[PDB]
């Protein structure tokens, strides 16, 4: 087992995917600011970025039966770069998607809509993987970025469900029912807030 | 020599420094609670120094002289910080942790969580003083801290947007906003109860 | 309806966005050069959008109409970024790396390093355009990039502070500032020569 | 060798010394901004913070003959938290020191002045270790912070000398003489800039 260059391979990945996050963050910040400038509403509440830790990446590769290599990771793992866009209201989610995908150097790679089709546990979010060019010192990389788009309420719910799920399944089955209740109650109140906000901005 | 009250520019400078002092304290508390218990009580923070426009209006509203000296004496929210927390009990955790510090003095406390306003507003308001070390002197300045949950914050942002138009028009939503505040309260109570159980 | 030229507020908004686009590009280049060669060519960066006050004066100075449309057409430094580099050759490294990018177009180049101004000023100035993706349209906007070493920057900050008083008074230092520029040049040449040797 | 708790000890150190850096950074930012507000000069050009990496800390402990433990590190290693304050002009260095040490919760612990007494290789900087209180969730720590105060020119010189020194002594002896020349030439030009700046701000 002499392969130390596999480790260098993953260190490169961390560096270039971190740069992809900066490119998309800047795009999103500009969209939010311009929309606010025109319509006096910020669709984005806040954003969170993370590059997948190498340990988490190797486990995912193993989980999926894939080789433990950077070439394989770059080809088959689409969430090495992840950004979470937390929006103020439900309709902001799809506004953000539309504004970003219109851009000529952003290509849609994968789309999963858990808002129209929530997961069994009650999870909601719009997930889009997009590619963006990253201009490095001596080459260009076109890299995927996984964007999770959700409301404040979806994010509150997901953070709590995550914390339960990441402490064994015994506990994740007491709260299953009550967590579903919460997801639905969050859905209902955000619908009302959205309804009010739409009327006062006609 | 007319009312060249430059003093208000001085106010903005030193109250902005007080905000940096308190923000640093809060960030350290959040980081350390996370280090020990694996939970961040703070979701995010927002700071603002009261604009001179709003400040003069408040002084007039209260029948006070239009001067920086009078503002520093009578207006406790020139420096404001908003601490948005993840769960209801984080609000009181943050308060307890800040007031334990030896260079933090409590000046005023209003808890609109235990006693919500008529329209449904909820938040814990504490005014504290902190020392600010300047180039040639020390100032002990008040800072208004609004501590609230994410849910309370969403509600307040929406209600604020209503009130800040022709304020007469669009008071039909009073009833429906109150419903939302109650519904947010109930869901956050349930989230809090779950979070308490899985963390002992 | 008098000259409610709100247009200048529009200008500030979109040229500020262009600055974010270029800054992100430069930061990524610096990070990657460091990753490969273990050197950061960038020491730090400073951004500013030209104030409306200065902008109208420039339009008047050039005999141009006082309008945002005219400003966007004729003023190439509404958005300015200053890239302060660690060594002299970093200046040209940064230029080469930026101009290689396919969505960056060169508009104008003035090299006051190869041809210093009379007072001793030195810097590389390149105006480039970049696309800015807004909510409902694309804008291709010029950005003035001043690229200089740390030594050039120290000199310029001091000279700027002189010129920006009663500008008639304090022109005795012209001679002594020129000496400093030459002395800074000579030391930075020597630092550069050492740095080149220990990095092959 | 079961001591895994030694590693936890050092992880605590990183966390609390990082907090000490935030406290001192905020103090310094406020001083610079207030001085600028009054006198229209920013004495600070920029600041750089770093918490010593655990590897570097263990090597220093070994170099000094000290036990490999967090208690020992906290007692005997004064640069776990380091901040570098780069100033615009020479006199700014001592202004910053004076303004900071006047504060009632800052105590001077150690002072080494390589400006009045430069090192043989030509290194210049004012080094002060100070203590500051850090208010944590359940306790207070009074922690040292090593502050390196220097001009822009001293910093340019030190960065280059560092890069030479950290590639074997063979090369660090060709440039010794020329590096001394540079340090002196930087000293002389900054004296002139300082002299001009003093006259135009009388
Ligand atoms: N808190 C929470 N997060 C979830 C849940 N499902 C997904 N996520 C998050 O959203 C990410 C992407 O989810 P998916 O869109 O379903 O991923 P995928 O389609 O299976 O493709 P791969 O993730 O690469 O395997 C996950 O990695 C999680 O971070 C859930 O039930 N609760
Ligand atoms: N969005 C929103 N904010 C509120 C409401 N009440 C208070 N606030 C905020 O909390 C701040 C302080 O309010 P209070 O503590 O009750 O005191 P006050 O009536 O505003 O005047 P003072 O006590 O002198 O400071 C206000 O200035 C607002 O920023 C509300 O119903 N909706
Ligand atoms: N501190 C300082 N800055 C300078 C000096 N010359 C230029 N600059 C800066 O560089 C900017 C651009 O200068 P130039 O490229 O030569 O062109 P210009 O004469 O200023 O007018 P335009 O070309 O139309 O943009 C100036 O606006 C200044 O910010 C100088 O002698 N001292
Ligand atoms: N670039 C450069 N840095 C130096 C030189 N000397 C010190 N430093 C830096 O400044 C730091 C502190 O230096 P000193 O004040 O001399 O430290 P000390 O008195 O020996 O006490 P300890 O460092 O704990 O052992 C060093 O750890 C270096 O980071 C030098 O000749 N060149
Ligand atoms: N697209 C994204 N944007 C921002 N943050 C994200 C994100 N995806 C994940 N995260 C966050 O990053 C942290 C670590 O998550 P990961 O280790 O990468 C496992 P995961 O990605 O969520 O599931 P997975 O590996 O099976 O795909 C989690 O706290 C988390 O929710
Ligand atoms: N007081 C300080 N403030 C800011 N940066 C610092 C600093 N001291 C050191 N550094 C920087 O931190 C990086 C790592 O330095 P360290 O690993 O901690 C060894 P050192 O501290 O410089 O010598 P030493 O360990 O013998 O005391 C170096 O690039 C560096 O110059
Ligand atoms: N304590 C605080 N922390 C953070 N942000 C605050 C804050 N107080 C107010 N703000 C914010 O500042 C904006 C307007 O503030 P102000 O001009 O000072 C009127 P106000 O402070 O809210 O009421 P008041 O003048 O009666 O006291 C609001 O959008 C807002 O909620
Ligand atoms: N390209 C640039 N990048 C970063 N900062 C800049 C910059 N150009 C100017 N500045 C800074 O902005 C300040 C004043 O700028 P301006 O109001 O626009 C006058 P100017 O741009 O320097 O000359 P000009 O109007 O003839 O073109 C100066 O302190 C300063 O050097
Ligand atoms: Fe403090
Ligand atoms: Fe871009
Ligand atoms: Mg994932
Ligand atoms: Mg108020
Ligand atoms: Mg200009
Ligand atoms: Mg050291």
Q: What are phi and psi of D49, to 5 degrees?
A: -120, 145
Cα distances (Å, whole numbers) of residue A60 to A17, A52, A56, A176? 17, 10, 6, 25
**What Rg, from alpha-carbon coordinates, does chain A have?**
19
Other C-beta atoms closer than 10 Å to the C-beta of C181 total 22
Q: How many CA atoms lie within 13 A of A4 on its CB side?
A: 1
CB B95 less than 6 A from any atom of ligand 2:
no
B104 Ramachandran zone, left/alpha/beta (phi>0; psi -120 to 50)? beta
Reading phi first (left if > 0) and then psi (alpha if -120 to 50, else beta), residue D168 is in left
Contact between residue D54 and residue B63 where contact means Cβ atoms under 8 Å apart: no
CA-based nearest residue to B98, from A150, A13, D137 = D137
Q: A126-135 and A107-113 as β-strands: parallel, antiparallel, unpaired?
A: antiparallel
Contact B32 D19 (CB under 8 A): yes
Element (H, E) at B153: helix B150-163
CB B177 within 8 A of CB A196: yes
CB neighbour burial string for A115-138, b if at least 16 within 10 angstroms, e if fewer = beebeeebbbbbbbbbbbbbbbbe
A98 touches chain C (CB under 8 A): no
Residue D147: count of CB within 10 angstroms of its CB: 23
Strand, helix or coil for residue D199: helix
Q: Which residues pair with D23 in a beta bridge?
A: none
The answer to whether the CB of A6 falls within 8 A of the CB of A73 is: no
C-beta neighbour count of C121 within 10 angstroms: 17
Helix H or strand E segment including B131: strand B124-133
Q: Specify whether the CB–CB gap between A81 and A47 falls below 8 A.
A: no
Angle at B120 between CA B114 and CA B126, to 5 degrees: 45
Q: Dihedral of the CA atoms A145, A149, A153, A157 (nearest 10)?
A: -40
Q: Which of B110, B96, B80 is nearest to B18 (CA)?
A: B80
In 3D space, the residue among A30, A35, A129 whose CA is nearest the CA of residue A79 turns out to be A129
Which string of DSSP letters, residue by residue, matches C93-128? HHHHHHHTSTT-EEEEEEETTTS--TT----EEEEE
Q: Residues C191-194: contacts with CB within 8 Å, 24+ apart?
A: C191/C87, C191/D156, C191/D157, C191/D160, C191/D182, C192/C87, C192/C88, C192/C89, C194/D160, C194/D164, C194/D175, C194/D178, C194/D179, C194/D182
Give me A189's structure tokens.
Answer: 């109140």
Neighbouring C-beta atoms of residue A165, cutoff 10 Å: 14
Helix axes B88-99, B174-197, angle to 10 degrees: 80
Tell me if B124 sits within 8 A of B112, measured CB to CB: yes
C-beta atoms of A156 and B86 within 8 A: yes
Detail the DSSP E strand segments found in chain D.
44-51, 81-87, 107-113, 126-135, 140-151
- Among C178, C73, A1, smallest CA distance to D193 is for C178
Quote the CA–CA distance of C137 and C121 in Å, as a whole number. 39
CA distance C111 to C162: 23
Neighbours of chain A (3+ CB pairs under 8 A): B, C
If you search the block for the tokens 């950074």, which residue do you land on? D25
What are phi and psi for residue A81, nearest 5 degrees? Answer: -95, 125
Mutate to test the pocket of ligand 8, among C43, C48, C57, C160 (most ligand atoms within 8 A of CB): C48
Q: C20 and A37: CB-CB below 8 Å?
A: no
List chains adjacent to chain B, taking adjacency as at least 3 C-beta pairs closer than 8 Å: A, D
Torsions phi, psi for A106 (to 5 deg): -115, 120
CA distances from C25 to B11, C19, D31 (A): 38, 10, 33
Element (H, E) at B180: helix B174-197
Q: Is B191 on the interface with A (CB under 8 A)?
A: yes
φ/ψ of C89, rounded to 5, equals -70, -20
Q: Which domains does chain A have, with CATH numbers?
A: 1-154 (3.30.460.10), 155-202 (no CATH)
- Ligand 3 atom closest to Cα of C120? 31
Q: Where are the beta strands (DSSP E) in A114-180?
A: 126-135, 140-151
Q: How was this structure determined?
A: X-ray
| CA pair distance A186, A89, nearest whole angstrom | 12
DSSP H or E segment with residue A83? strand A81-87
- Strands B124-133 and B138-149, sheet pairing: antiparallel
**Cα gap A136→A130, rounded to integer Å:** 19
Q: Are D110 and D79 in contact (CB under 8 A)?
A: no
Q: Are B17 and B79 in contact (CB under 8 A)?
A: no
Are B159 and B117 within 8 A, CB to CB? no
How many CA atoms within 13 Å lie on the side-chain side of B104?
22
Contact B146, B82 (CB under 8 A): yes
Measured distance CA(D36)–CA(A110) in Å, rounded: 52
| Residue whose CA lies nearest to ligand 8 atom number 19 | C54
**What are the percentages of helix, strand and coil residues in chain A, rounded to 5?**
55, 20, 25
Query: Looking at beta carbons, which residues of chain D come within 8 Å of B33?
Result: 137
Residues whose CB is less than 8 angstroms from the CB of residue C20 and which lie 6 or more positions away in sequence, other chains included: A26, A29, A30
* A154: exposed, middle or buried (Cβ count in 10 Å: 0-12, 13-18, 19+): buried
| CA separation for the pair B121, B126 (Å, rounded) | 16
The DSSP bridge partners found for residue B141 are: B130
Residues C130 and C160 sit within 8 Å (Cβ to Cβ) = no
Instruction: Report the residue among D73, D148, D149 best suited for mutation to probe ligand 4: largest number of ligand atoms under 8 A from its CB.
Output: D148
What's the CA gap between A127 and B176, in Å, rounded? 32
Contact between B141 and B129 (Cβ < 8 Å): yes
Helix (H) or strand (E) segment spanning residue A99: helix A90-101
Specify the DSSP class assigned to residue D175: S
Q: How far apart are CA B92 and CA B107, in angstroms?
A: 17
Q: How far is the CA of D95 from the centre of ligand 14 (A)?
A: 23
Nearest to C47 by CA among C17, C71, C73: C17
Cβ-Cβ contacts under 8 Å for D75 (sequence gap 6 or more): none
CB B171 within 8 A of CB B107: no
Interface test with chain D among C44, C87, C150, by most D beta carbons within 10 Å:
C150
Resolution of the entry in angstroms: 2.2
Q: Closest Cα to residue B98, out of B187, B24, B35?
A: B24
Number of neighbouring beta carbons within 10 Å of residue C119: 15
D146, with CB counted inside 10 A (0-12, 13-18, 19+), is buried
User: Which tokens belong to A111?
Assistant: 């789309």
Phi, psi dihedral angles at C104 (to 5 degrees): -115, 125
- Feature table: binding site of C: 21, 58, 62, 77, 108, 110, 112, 117, 119, 121, 125, 144, 146, 156, 159
**C20 contacts in A (CB within 8 Å)?**
26, 29-30
Mutate to test the pocket of ligand 3, among C108, C121, C157 (most ligand atoms within 8 A of CB): C121
DSSP secondary structure letter of residue A48? E
Cβ contact C28–A38 (<8 Å): no
Contact B66, B52 (CB under 8 A): no
Alpha-carbon distance A93 to C51, whole Å? Answer: 35
Q: Distances from the Cα of C134 to the Cαs of A34, A146, C140, D15, in angstroms?
A: 6, 21, 11, 41
């Amino acid at each position: 087992d002499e392969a130390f260059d596999t480790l260098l391979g993953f260190v490169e990945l961390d560096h270039i995917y971190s740069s992809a996050l900066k490119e998309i963050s800047t795009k999103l910040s500009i969209l939010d600011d311009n929309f606010n400038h025109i319509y006096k509403h910020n669709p984005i509440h806040h954003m969170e970025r993370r590059v997948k830790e190498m340990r988490s990446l190797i486990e995912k590769l193993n989980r999926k039966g894939l080789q433990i290599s950077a070439e394989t990771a770059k080809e088959h793992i689409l969430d090495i770069a992840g950004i979470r866009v937390v929006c103020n209201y439900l309709d902001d989610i799809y506004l953000i998607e539309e504004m970003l995908l219109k851009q000529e150097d952003v290509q849609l790679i994968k789309r999963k809509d858990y808002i129209q089709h929530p997961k069994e546990n009650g999870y909601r979010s719009l997930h889009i993987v997009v590619s963006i060019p990253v201009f490095l010192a001596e080459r260009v990389e076109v890299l995927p970025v996984e964007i999770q788009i959700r409301t404040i309420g979806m994010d509150m719910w997901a953070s709590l469900e995550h914390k339960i799920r990441y402490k064994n399944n015994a506990e994740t089955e007491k709260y299953r029912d009550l967590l579903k209740e919460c997801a639905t109650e969050i859905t209902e109140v955000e619908d009302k807030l959205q309804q009010i906000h739409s009327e006062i901005t006609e």
